[PDB]
Design a protein around this ligand. Sequence first.
Ligand SMILES: *[C@](=O)([C]([N]C(=O)[C]N1C(=O)C([N])=[C]N=C1C1=[C][C]=[C]S1)[C]([C])[C])C(F)(F)C(=O)[N][C][C]N1[C][C]O[C][C]1
Ligand code: NA
Length: 240
Amino acid sequence: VVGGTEAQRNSWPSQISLQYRSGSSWAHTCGGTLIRQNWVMTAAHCVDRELTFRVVVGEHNLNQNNGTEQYVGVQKIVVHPYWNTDDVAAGYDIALLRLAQSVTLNSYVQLGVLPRAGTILANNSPCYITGWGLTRTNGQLAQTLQQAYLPTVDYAICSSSSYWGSTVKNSMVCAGGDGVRSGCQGDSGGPLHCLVNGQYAVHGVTSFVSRLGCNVTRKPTVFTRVSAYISWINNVIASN
Ligand SMILES: *[C@](=O)([C]([N]C(=O)[C]N1C(=O)C([N])=[C]N=C1C1=[C][C]=[C]S1)[C]([C])[C])C(F)(F)C(=O)[N][C][C]N1[C][C]O[C][C]1
Ligand code: NA
């Protein structure tokens, strides 16, 4: 997250760290959202590689014992049928991961709340992106969970020439675009928490940024619109 501030320990308890094994250690590669005690929602492009993955919940500092983490293995990955590896711009960048075991909920570990199907947010709605990704374009990963205020940019403005044009579809939500704050490498798959009727609900799964850099004026961070996939999600959990 570029332009972020450190998040308090118990602010976004549905956030997870998706790690794969590298050598003898595991390395953070993407974020995610706990939606069931044994189901995580992330970006399809995070789990494309044939790697061994693990989910860490209750995580705050990546390289230090917080005394609140639970480490669970991933036993089933279900990527969206229409996802196309060579195609973040086509969409369907969503994947559900079945955990090997149910995690225990407490104040650092809670389920993120999902929006009703078809729910579209008004322009400039108040949202926060969270994650441990690069803090600067070409920089390094954050050690502690960072958060950044990222108001939405509706489809009309976002698909306009000066913004993303045709690269963005209606099954995606844009947030940010100020040149100061944004998602960045390592935040992929995490939540975009938006406040609707006094409650924060996860409206986007972090997908992509500009090839020029993370914080680019008029190139808001782009997320997969969770409300476009509510039936697919329930259909997967119901049959797995
Ligand atoms: C996300 O964190 C990342 N998303 C992408 O990079 C997706 N993407 C783009 O943003 C652009 N501009 C073009 N293509 C793509 C891709 C297509 C297929 C795979 S990526 C964020 C910018 C939201 C990530 F992709 F998952 C990623 O970068 N994760 C790796 C993080 N590493 C961890 C180790 O240290 C370096 C960063
Ligand atoms: Na930790």
